[PDB]
Design goal:
This is part of a larger assembly, with chains A (138 residues), B (51 residues) and C (132 residues). With 138 residues, chain A is α/β, with parallel strands linked by helices. Chain A is 38% helix and 11% strand. In chain A, the strands form 2 sheets. A 3-stranded parallel β-sheet of chain A has the order 1-2-4. A two-stranded antiparallel sheet of chain A has the order 3-5. The chains are: A alpha/beta (138), B little secondary structure (51), C alpha/beta (132). Chain C binds 4 RNA strands through helix 1 and helix 2. Chain B: This is Large ribosomal subunit protein uL4.
Chain lengths: 138, 51, 132
RNA sequence: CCCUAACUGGAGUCCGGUGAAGCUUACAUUCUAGUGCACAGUCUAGAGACCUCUAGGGGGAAGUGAAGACCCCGUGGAGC
RNA sequence: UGGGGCCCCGAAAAUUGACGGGGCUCAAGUCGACCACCGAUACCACGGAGUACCGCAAGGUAAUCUCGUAGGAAGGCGUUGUGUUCGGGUCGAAGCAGGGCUGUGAAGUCCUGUGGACCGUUCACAAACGAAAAUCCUGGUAAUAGUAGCAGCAAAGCAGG
RNA sequence: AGCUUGUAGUCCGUAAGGGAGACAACCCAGCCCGUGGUUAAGGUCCCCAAGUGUCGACUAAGUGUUAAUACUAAAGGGCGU
RNA sequence: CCCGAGAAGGGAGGUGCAAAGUGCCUGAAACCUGAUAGUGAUGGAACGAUACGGCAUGAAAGGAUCUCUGGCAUGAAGGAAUCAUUCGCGAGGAUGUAGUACGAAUGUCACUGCCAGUGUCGUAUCUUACGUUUUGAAGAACGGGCCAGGGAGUGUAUCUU
C-alpha cells in the first residue's frame, strides 16, 4: 500500500512497475489524486487535454479521466501489459482516489526518491487538478 | 512425329490460360514436351551411333 | 553377452557425439511445414532472397560439415556397437562379436531368421533386430 | 426539381426442395504513426480488441475480370 | 561596449500519435570530466568436424584455413536398366501409413500394421535419371456454399374424389 | 532533388550475428559445430540485462529526451538566464 | 432368414488362404465424415528455430555405469565473496586474502527408474513466406487454391582442348 501523496508520477510509476515485475506482492496505491506532475500548469494541462481528446475515441485511444485510473494507465505504459507477465502485474495493482474504506488505517509506505520536495521549483500541478480540469468527478 | 502430329496452336494472351499450343477445337494442350500426350524432349534417336 | 571393446578415448568421443547429436537440428527443407506438397528431406536453399539461404539464425541451421560426429565413433550404433547389416547366414563369419552387432535384413524370412539367430547366439554376436 | 410521401405486382427478407460459378501462397479481430522499391491487416512503437451468427450499403483489401489498346523499345510484323 | 553557453520569439496543414512508448525538471535533458556494471557467433579456453599443404605411413603445421550471388573445380546420394559377383522372398517381395537408429546431407537401414509376388547386392557401364514454381499440362478435389439462380413470359390456381 | 554525371576508399549487390524502434549498404563484426568466460558497438528510471551512479555547472522552454544519413527550420531580435 | 414399397439397400449369415463382392489386385495425397491427444470464447498474425516448463504418449525398431540425484579427485580460459591497510571530493580504485574458494570438462564411487523421441499448448529471444524480375522484394511488382503424376543441355557432322 503506497501513498501517492506528494510523489512524482513517473518515478512512482517506475518504482511500482519494477516491484510488480519483481513479482512477489500486490500493490495498492491510495490518494492517486495527490500525485505530482512537475512542469508548468499550462503545459501539463495542454498535453493532457491533447492526450484526452486525441484519438479516434469512437474506435481509437480511450484515455481515462479519474486520477486513479490515469495513474493506472501511466503504470500500464511502463509494463509489458500485452504479455502474460504484464497482465499479471496489472491484475495485482489497485489504485484509489483517497483511501478506500477497507485499507483505512492500514500501514502505508512512501518512496523516498519519488518525494516531491526534491523538486527544485514550484512549477507543478496535481493529478487531481488535471483530472478535474479534464472533467472527472471523484 | 510421336506427340507431334497435331495442328495445335496457341490461344495467345487475353484468356487466362498458359500460352502453350492448344487443339484448334478444344482447350486440351498438345505437342509440347510438358503437355500430356506431348512429344518427348530429347529422346533416344535411332540415328545415334553407339558403336 | 560380451562387453564392448571401447577404450577410454573412444568412450569419451562416444559421449561427445551423444551430447552433440542431442543438439544437432533436424535439417528440414525450408518452409516444409507450410506446404504439404514438400517433403521433409534437405534441399539446399537456392533463391537470392531466401532468409535461410542468407542464414538468418531464426530460420534454422544450414547443413554444414561442422555438425559431423567425431570420426572415431562415426556410424556407431547408440549402444556402442558397429552396425553390420546381415543379409544371410554366411555373413556371420566375417564379424567379430567384440565390437560388432549384426542387424538382420528386414526381408529375411522367419525360417532363415531363426537359424541366423541360433548361429549368432552360439557365436556370441549381439543382435539388434531379433524377436523378443 | 424544391422534397419527398403513400400504395400496387415481381424480387429481396423468413421457410421446404433443388443447386452452380468467379478472386484464393499462408495467416488474419483491427486502428494511428513511422519505416520500407518513397501508397503496410502481417515490419517497428503505440492504441484497441471476448467469441459465433443474421441482415444491410459498398469505405479498404492500391478488390476481381485482362501478359496496358496511352508512351517508348524490338536492326518484330501488317496494310496503305 | 565586445566576445560566449543554454533557452525564448520569429514558428501556419490537413484521420488520432509519436523523444520507439510510458514518462522525465539540482533530470530519466544539455555541457565538461569520471566510476562501476550490462551487453555478440568478436576475443580467449576446452572439445569436435571439414579444409589446404607436407609426410611412404604414423602423423605434422594453420595468428597468417572455414561468409558468399553469377560462375569454375572436386567428391558423393538417389531412379531405371545391362554385364558380372554374392543373395533375399508365400515361415510373406515391391509398394503404402506411421515410427526407431545412423549419416552434415543427398539418403540408407530397421520396427509395427497393411499388402500378396517379386526384390536386392560387389565391381563397372548406360540413360527417355531426381521438380515447388513455367497466368505449366492431364486428372482428381476444396473454400466460395447449401450461397446465386429456379422472379419480365402472362391473372399461373382452389375444392372434392 | 532520395536529381544527373565523375573520381579515391569501403560497402550492399553476394554479408550472417550484436546494436541503433524498425533501417540493403550507419556502428561493432566478417560467420564451421558445442560448452564456459571476458569484451566491442551501444546502453544502464520502467518497458529491457545493467546506475533513480559520482563530481561541477547550465536549461523552465516538456526546449530536449535525434552519431552519420536528406528522416533534424532560417534571417533578425531578446533590460530570459 | 429379418427390416425395407422394393428384383434398391441394410442387417444377420455364408463362400474363399485372403472379400478381392463384379469400373472388384495394391489403394497414396488433396478433399470430406467421425474419434482420440493437446488447447480453447481477454486474444495478435510467415504458422517455424532455439532454450525451459504443463498435459498426453513413450510395445517394436533407441539407451541400462543408460536416466535421475549427490559425494570425491583432477581441472583450461576465467576467477570471486568477506574482511584488513591505503588512495580518491565522490561514485569507487589499489595491495593482501587469492590466482585461493570456484570453474567447461575429464575420471571415479554411490543413489535412482527413468531418459531419448513424438504430438499439442505455454513462457523467453529471434525471424515481414517461397521462386523470379530487380541497384533495391514482405511489397500496394509478377507466379502458384490444393494434391497426385508428367515436365527442360539431347544426337549427327566438324574444330579445339
Amino acid at each position: 500500500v503506497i501513498d501517492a501523496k506528494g510523489l512524482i508520477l513517473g518515478r512512482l510509476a517506475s518504482s511500482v512497475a519494477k516491484q510488480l515485475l519483481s513479482g512477489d506482492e500486490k500493490v495498492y496505491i491510495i490518494n492517486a489524486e495527490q500525485a505530482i506532475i512537475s512542469g508548468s500548469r499550462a503545459a501539463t494541462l495542454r498535453e493532457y487535454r491533447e492526450t484526452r481528446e486525441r484519438g479516434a475515441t469512437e474506435f481509437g485511444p480511450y484515455f481515462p479521466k479519474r486520477p486513479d485510473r490515469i495513474l493506472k494507465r501511466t503504470i500500464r505504459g511502463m509494463l509489458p501489459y500485452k504479455r502474460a507477465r504484464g497482465r499479471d502485474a496489472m491484475s495485482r495493482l489497485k489504485v484509489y482516489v483517497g483511501v478506500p474504506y477497507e485499507l483505512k488505517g492500514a500501514e502505508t509506505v512512501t518512496i523516498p526518491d519519488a518525494d516531491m520536495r526534491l523538486l527544485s521549483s514550484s512549477r507543478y500541478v496535481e493529478l487531481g487538478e488535471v483530472s478535474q480540469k479534464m472533467g472527472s468527478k471523484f | 512425329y510421336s506427340g507431334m502430329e497435331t495442328s495445335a496452336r496457341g490461344w495467345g494472351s487475353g484468356r487466362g490460360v498458359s500460352h502453350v499450343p492448344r487443339l484448334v477445337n478444344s482447350s486440351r494442350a498438345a505437342r509440347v514436351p510438358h503437355a500430356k500426350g506431348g512429344r518427348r524432349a530429347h529422346p533416344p534417336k535411332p540415328e545415334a551411333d553407339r558403336s | 553377452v560380451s562387453t564392448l571393446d571401447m577404450d577410454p578415448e573412444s568412450r569419451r568421443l562416444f559421449n561427445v557425439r551423444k551430447v552433440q547429436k542431442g543438439k544437432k537440428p533436424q535439417f528440414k527443407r525450408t518452409c516444409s511445414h507450410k506446404f504439404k506438397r514438400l517433403d521433409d528431406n534437405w534441399r539446399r536453399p537456392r533463391g537470392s532472397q531466401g532468409k535461410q539461404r542468407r542464414k538468418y539464425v531464426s530460420k534454422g541451421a544450414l547443413v554444414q560439415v561442422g555438425y559431423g560426429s567425431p570420426a572415431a565413433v562415426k556410424g556407431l550404433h547408440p549402444s556402442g556397437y558397429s552396425d553390420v547389416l546381415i543379409s544371410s547366414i554366411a555373413e556371420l563369419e566375417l564379424v567379430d562379436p567384440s565390437y560388432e552387432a549384426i542387424r538382420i535384413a528386414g526381408t529375411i524370412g522367419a525360417q532363415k531368421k531363426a537359424l541366423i539367430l541360433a548361429k549368432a547366439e552360439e557365436a556370441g554376436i549381439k543382435v539388434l533386430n531379433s524377436g523378443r
